[PDB]
Ligand binder design. Sequence first.
Ligand SMILES: NC(=O)c1ccc[n+]([C@@H]2O[C@H](COP(=O)([O-])OP(=O)(O)OC[C@H]3O[C@@H](n4cnc5c(N)ncnc54)[C@H](OP(=O)(O)O)[C@@H]3O)[C@@H](O)[C@H]2O)c1
Ligand SMILES: NC(=O)c1ccc[n+]([C@@H]2O[C@H](COP(=O)([O-])OP(=O)(O)OC[C@H]3O[C@@H](n4cnc5c(N)ncnc54)[C@H](OP(=O)(O)O)[C@@H]3O)[C@@H](O)[C@H]2O)c1
Lengths: 414, 414
Amino acid sequence: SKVVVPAQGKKITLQNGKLNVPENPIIPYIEGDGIGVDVTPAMLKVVDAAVEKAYKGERKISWMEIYTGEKSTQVYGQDVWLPAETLDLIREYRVAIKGPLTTPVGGGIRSLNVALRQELDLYICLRPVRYYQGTPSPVKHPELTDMVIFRENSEDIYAGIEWKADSADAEKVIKFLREEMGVKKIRFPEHCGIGIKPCSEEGTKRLVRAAIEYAIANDRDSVTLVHKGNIMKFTEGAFKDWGYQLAREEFGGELIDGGPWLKVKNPNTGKEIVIKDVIADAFLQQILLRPAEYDVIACMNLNGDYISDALAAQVGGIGIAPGANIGDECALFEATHGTAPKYAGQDKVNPGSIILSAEMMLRHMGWTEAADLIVKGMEGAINAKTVTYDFERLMDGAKLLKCSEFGDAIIENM
Amino acid sequence: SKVVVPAQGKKITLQNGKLNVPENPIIPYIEGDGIGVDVTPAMLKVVDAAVEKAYKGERKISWMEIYTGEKSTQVYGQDVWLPAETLDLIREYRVAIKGPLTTPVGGGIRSLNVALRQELDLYICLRPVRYYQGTPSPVKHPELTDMVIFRENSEDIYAGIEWKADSADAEKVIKFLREEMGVKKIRFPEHCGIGIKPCSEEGTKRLVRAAIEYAIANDRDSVTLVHKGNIMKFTEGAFKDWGYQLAREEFGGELIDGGPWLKVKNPNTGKEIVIKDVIADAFLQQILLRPAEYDVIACMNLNGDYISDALAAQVGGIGIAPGANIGDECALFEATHGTAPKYAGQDKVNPGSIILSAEMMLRHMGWTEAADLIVKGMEGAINAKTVTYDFERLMDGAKLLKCSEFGDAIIENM
Ligand SMILES: NC(=O)c1ccc[n+]([C@@H]2O[C@H](COP(=O)([O-])OP(=O)(O)OC[C@H]3O[C@@H](n4cnc5c(N)ncnc54)[C@H](OP(=O)(O)O)[C@@H]3O)[C@@H](O)[C@H]2O)c1
Ligand SMILES: NC(=O)c1ccc[n+]([C@@H]2O[C@H](COP(=O)([O-])OP(=O)(O)OC[C@H]3O[C@@H](n4cnc5c(N)ncnc54)[C@H](OP(=O)(O)O)[C@@H]3O)[C@@H](O)[C@H]2O)c1
């Protein structure tokens, strides 16, 4: 009802597991709450400039705004935070992008971001994290970090299955656990909240399957299964066993030494990709202490949230970290930072995250020239130290830029 | 049967919630697997020197070795990894310490460390993390970190309640969830592992209760409730609500501004302690980016493992991080690093962790003079750059020391 389909423009289709993108594709975008009003306009202009420059006017995106979050309630009504129409629009047009989203508190509503992921079955959360020269960073050698996180996106405790302490359901579940499953380890059964943590074999293998294909298509050096399997043997640990098993079953994994690592040969470059694993709490230490040893990461939903968010901070990219939610049929790219309501509307915020997510989106569309230009623009703008206040306040000799002006700087550095 | 109670020596008792420690107390200690054979002897000698120097010969510990892990199987037999006698010994003598422990794989045995914590109901995992000048660190300003972690120690998913995919129990639980609880969010119900995540109100409030008392007794600046409550509302989120509620109910918490932070007045110094909260994935970023803003931390079991282990790495103290497991009746202090089998027996390992845990143990015993001397010794030895290989290999100008020699250096710097 209130979305306007672009007069000129054409739908992306999926054929044979491969996107068919027209030169005039319609892309759905969600402005986002808070500073989404600042960064989305910059992102539109930066992407159009990259597309115009890479294909000399032969291609062009027909943006189409759709809604989620506050703007959805002001467009559709009182408690329409995520209209069915927005899900249908993303499935019809295959590829979309959105700014920051916040979920209201006090109405029993659970994460809108996670709702999008789970209802579009975008089981890959893809966070590439690598250091942009010139970025102010808390660690000494941020340039050693160059990883790609494959975070499982629908199952784990992150999935939102839980009962409230003292509710009839929680006490029903606890009664079933103690009396029918014989559980004795619930220290205090009264006034106790309960959460469920599921992890299946198919969900594990389609997430690791994507990670290893990614290592192959991008010739990277390894895939590390991160887990907390010595405590949670049947979810985290199973994730790690199924991941190794997939590597053997579908990518000819061979045993290194006495194990447990494997090596997968890259069919296209001959490079032996190492498959290995690290327990999650030690991994949070290793990304600081021995960052160059890691590359592609495969892990479950909650660990992936932590790991992405720790890596982004340690390269000083907490505000420019790109992110994508990808499934077999649809894809939703997103700004990964908060809504920062304090500065919303002041044209202050750093648009780098949603712009790099747009870079991912173009590359997912097969428009790699335009995507390369955006990386190149971020490269030069940040290396030139012409940046927004969240960068500039941490450093000397930088030129302070509004949000919109940083978008221009990126275009100027393409 | 194989433990020898010390001829001379006397049992610590608990009276009125307060330890009564004799001048000749018997302390039970577990050597620990792997490098425990290296660091425990250094720790015995360092603690005895501190006690001898602080009390001029009037006090002295009667160590008593007890067993867990490999040495237990070689002392008691084939699969005796954790003899009942060791639990009884720790409850009889109240205070003990142990080196690194590893749990065997392939026999269905779950963490020996966690078994000790849960069966002695040591619900506080206490990790103080602060930077020792001279330590090689991956970040630029490690000296800004000075935190104390209160990690909940018996409940959360960390508690080891789970079924294996395809087992009759997992399929029984999944059937109950889908058919009797109406759960629709399990993406793939087949071949799916299940874990339970419990969090009670009493468990939350006795853990936060200890954290706030600690902030009071040590005049620190704040207590931060760390959680992942926007996704797990009834466990992580409840932990955070119960924590605030305790602060109001028992420590006169008053609202700051419009909330949600509180302020608790320190009954002894008048200092207003801030009670606040941060969501766990953002917190892993904040301990890097704004570390000076945090002090005492209160959080649940799994987050506490991650947070302690990330902080230790970021001050370069991955091998000297102290740790204690404390309950209302018993206490078990521990080395917090792995068993490092590769270097075990070579007198290489860094004894700093178990020695600082001994420092905690003495201070828990009321022997604060001896504890102060050990801190002072670690201070000087590390500042003098007379350290073991894990420090020395990361730095220039250091003097390489065996494990035993570093223990001497600590004594020499008391
Ligand atoms: N993945 C996501 O899209 C995502 C993840 C979590 C939360 N959010 C949402 O965001 C809301 C915003 O409000 P909050 O105050 O509660 O946030 P908050 O995350 O605790 O705070 C974020 C802070 O990071 C900075 N920042 C955020 N985005 C930035 C960007 N793009 N460029 C530069 N700096 C940026 C601002 O700090 P300075 O003022 O220091 O610059 C900002 O206020 C939350 O309630 C939440 O639902 C979105
Ligand atoms: N809290 C605990 O007590 C605890 C926690 C987890 C694991 N562990 C156990 O430890 C076992 C040891 O074997 P792993 O090889 O599997 O360990 P791992 O933790 O993956 O490796 C630890 C590495 O840290 C270094 N290190 C460990 N303790 C140190 C110390 N005290 N001083 C200086 N450097 C230290 C050594 O690295 P460099 O060679 O680079 O120096 C070491 O091999 C594990 O299987 C596990 O059950 C104990």
